Symmetry: C2
């Protein structure tokens, strides 16, 4: 739930900046062997510590825009159902449960086109039932974006 | 607009960014030389800003926090963004349109006392806001980047 080897953390920090570094390059940077780096990364993946090797794109240049959906549920049972209902939607990039004004926070990747975007938002919202409050925030600018 | 191959390339790399050019050429039915060139272009144009990973935050001993900010006047948003964008534990900053015009994601240690220290240090840099809401994330059910 927290404590993790010092070298494993460095490895995570490094891979988050350049996930394509070969085991050899990693071994050189960390003054260890390629074999040991291989085993470490393999364990990290097996343990679910590293869940995916992906990329950070400039969504605007790809023709997309983000939207953040803030949800306040009426009851827990409804929250979990909403979450299972939307977690499989492809354009839903993240789903989180929180403690505060909104208990469900969702990020959507939408088409940059306002009419297509609005149609898509309406479709998504139809899937949200039993909510006391739903706030949609259209993201006009992404200034900073990192995972860790 | 990016062409058919570039669009599909971004998609593939979003699923597995460690694919060898060989594996990519095979999928996209082309040559490693062409793959190398396309990716080089995508990176140079800034379409692909980074090759990263999605780790399990909880397993590393951290927790997220989303801060919702509503400026009193539009021009204030840029000021706040300039003031917080450099903070190490600020993971994302976005300008938005709606009930809140600034959304920030923070990476914090799970220890509530240590997390509070970081949150307070961060909130200190947000001057004269109309509304500020801090939401601690108890669980990440899904996390992807496109």
């Amino acid at each position: 739930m927290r404590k993790l080897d010092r070298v494993d953390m460095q490895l995570v920090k490094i891979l988050s900046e350049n996930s394509r570094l070969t085991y050899r390059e990693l071994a050189d940077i960390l003054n260890t062997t390629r074999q040991r780096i291989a085993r470490r990364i393999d364990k990290l993946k097996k343990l679910g510590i590293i869940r995916k090797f992906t990329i950070i794109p400039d969504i605007d240049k790809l023709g997309y825009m983000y939207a953040i959906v803030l949800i306040k549920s009426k009851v827990p049972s409804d929250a979990d159902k909403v979450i299972s209902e939307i977690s499989d939607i492809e354009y839903v990039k993240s789903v989180e449960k929180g403690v505060g004004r909104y208990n469900i926070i969702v990020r959507l990747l939408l088409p940059k086109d306002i009419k297509d975007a609005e149609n898509l938002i309406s479709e998504f919202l139809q899937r949200i039932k039993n909510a006391e409050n739903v706030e949609v925030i259209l993201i006009s600018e992404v200034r900073k974006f990192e995972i860790i």
